[PDB]
Design a protein around this ligand. Structure first.
Ligand SMILES: *C(=O)[C@H]([C@@H](C)O)[C@H]1C[C@@H](SCC/N=C\N)C(C(=O)O)=N1
Length: 231
């Protein structure tokens, strides 16, 4: 059920950036693998900023914040979803607390579900790790309102993840970059809502280097989605 797709062209997209990457695509429970390092799909990596999605779900579900709260630029949880915003989501993680965080991460079963003893950095340097296949499954469940959280909480977090609209397609997702571990890990995890309402989920995972532009992840994602006729 998890197979290499028609990967002739996309393999070369990653080769031209001289790095190792995988793109996982999930349609209705069919998963296909693309890129030039397909073994990455079942390899565990720190989630980095992609964990903000689950942090937000947990914080909103447990009424540790709400979508209108202004965190002292002064900004909301949703505004902070796009930005670096280490202070907002670190503050939210401290409000949740280590015990509730570990309980929720175990209930969701996210990755290896281990968060250690420091509630405000376990997603960046370990010990929490997750595979790209696990990330695409998680975000597919979010997109379909199938996670075990309030429907309204899931809708509110989805609304924070809109990256852009084009020609009737909506692209939702979340970037991550673990720059302080070696090798560095880059993420772009999300989904496409096609004009007729169909959902196609993706998880891009690649080795980063410090000279790369952050936009390299979106660049590779968009050219691959176009080649696959997903957009
Ligand atoms: C999450 O992955 C990042 C922080 C919150 O941990 C957040 C910030 C930027 S990375 C900043 C450094 N750039 C290169 N080393 C980011 C991202 O671009 O995905 N996410």
């Amino acid at each position: 059920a998890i197979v290499q797709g028609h990967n002739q062209v996309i393999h070369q997209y990653f080769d031209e950036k001289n790095t190792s990457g995988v793109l996982v695509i999930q349609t209705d429970k069919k998963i296909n693998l693309y890129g030039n390092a397909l073994s990455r799909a079942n390899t565990e990596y720190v989630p980095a900023s992609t964990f903000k999605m689950l942090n937000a779900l947990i914080g909103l579900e447990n009424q540790k914040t709400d979508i209108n709260e202004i965190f002292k630029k002064d900004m909301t949880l949703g505004e902070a979803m796009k930005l670096s915003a280490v202070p907002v989501y670190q503050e939210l993680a401290r409000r949740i607390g280590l015990d509730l965080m570990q309980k929720e991460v175990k209930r969701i079963g996210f990755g290896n579900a281990e968060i250690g003893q420091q509630v405000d950095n376990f997603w960046l340097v370990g010990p929490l790790k997750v595979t790209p296949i696990q990330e695409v499954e998680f975000v597919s469940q979010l997109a379909h309102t199938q996670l075990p959280f309030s429907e309204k909480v899931q809708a509110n977090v989805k609304n924070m993840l809109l990256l852009e609209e084009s020609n009737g397609y909506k692209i939702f997702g979340k970037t991550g970059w673990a720059a302080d571990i070696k090798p560095q890990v880059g993420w772009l995890t999300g989904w496409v809502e096609q004009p007729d309402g169909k959902i196609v989920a993706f998880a891009l995972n690649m080795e980063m280097r410090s000279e790369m532009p952050a936009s390299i992840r979106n660049e590779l994602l968009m050219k691959s989605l176009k080649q696959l006729n997903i957009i």
